[PDB]
Amino acid sequence: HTLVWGVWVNGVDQGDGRNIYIRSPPNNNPVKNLTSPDMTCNVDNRVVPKSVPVNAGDTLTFEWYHNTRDDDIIASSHHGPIAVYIAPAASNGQGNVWVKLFEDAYNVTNSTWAVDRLITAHGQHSVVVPHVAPGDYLFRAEIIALHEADSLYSQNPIRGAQFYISCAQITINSSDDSTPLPAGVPFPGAYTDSTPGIQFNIYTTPATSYVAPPPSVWSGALGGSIAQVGDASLE
Ligand SMILES: OC[C@H]1O[C@@H](O[C@H]2[C@H](O)[C@@H](O)[C@H](O[C@H]3[C@H](O)[C@@H](O)[C@H](O[C@H]4[C@H](O)[C@@H](O)[C@H](O)O[C@@H]4CO)O[C@@H]3CO)O[C@@H]2CO)[C@H](O)[C@@H](O)[C@@H]1O
Ligand SMILES: [Cl-]
Ligand SMILES: [Cl-]
Ligand SMILES: [Cl-]
Ligand SMILES: [Cl-]
Ligand SMILES: [Cl-]
Ligand SMILES: [Cl-]
Ligand SMILES: [Cl-]
Ligand SMILES: [Cl-]
Ligand SMILES: [Cl-]
Ligand SMILES: [Cl-]
Ligand SMILES: [Cl-]
Ligand SMILES: [Cl-]
Ligand SMILES: [Cl-]
Ligand SMILES: [Cl-]
Ligand SMILES: [Cl-]
Ligand SMILES: [Cl-]
Ligand SMILES: [Cl-]
Ligand SMILES: [Cl-]
């Protein structure tokens, strides 16, 4: 159970984005139905009044929270991966449009899930804004909690992989467009009952065997991190 509070740009807090530049749902409950229209941008996908200005190469940091800013972020039971996707805003997230910029799942080197490191990072994870065409974009940040994922939701609706999905409205101003954004995958549709990484038993299957759901990270992606970029409590 987690939500995005807002974003940072080059380590500068853009301030509370909820219902402003984030297409905030009404609560922190997960999406679980893989075929739901709610897979695109969660249950209340509409244009919000603001879009955060960025340039290609900027560090764009998403900041999550559970109940209040810079709290426990997400229950520690909610082990799983984190991804970030981009689509042109004109699509409203419809069609074959989502391109993956970032994936982190289970890190063998430090024996931790992305969500574990998200909590340590005070809810902050970043991407480098890619060299796509200037314009308006949706950045879809997705946490998959796998603590009940041994079942398919389609078999047992009380269980299933949990998707915490947040779409931020970002405007890319300066960009050399050296990596034009290609077509991507649809949400809903990219994840199905048979997709690797959706049905996974964290209790009995080693995390060193976990493969996050495709698609793979785009060749044009510039990278990211899970790391605290700013101190919320210095406000
Ligand atoms: O054993 C089951 C499973 O539970 C996981 O814990 C989940 C709970 O199942 C879930 O019910 C709980 O939901 C909370 C949510 O986290 C809170 O953010 C929300 O708070 C409300 C509050 O109740 C209202 O009074 C107020 O106005 O709004 C806030 C929202 O800011 O309350 C909901 C409803 O209870 O979330 C838990 C995860 O955080 C365990 O983690 C897991 O290990 C277990 O397997
Ligand atoms: Cl839960
Ligand atoms: Cl700057
Ligand atoms: Cl809801
Ligand atoms: Cl709900
Ligand atoms: Cl916890
Ligand atoms: Cl197409
Ligand atoms: Cl390990
Ligand atoms: Cl950190
Ligand atoms: Cl242009
Ligand atoms: Cl099942
Ligand atoms: Cl482009
Ligand atoms: Cl382009
Ligand atoms: Cl293409
Ligand atoms: Cl696979
Ligand atoms: Cl990948
Ligand atoms: Cl690619
Ligand atoms: Cl790609
Ligand atoms: Cl490329």
Ligand SMILES: [Cl-]
């Ligand atoms: Cl910091």
Ligand SMILES: [Cu+2]
């Ligand atoms: Cu939860």
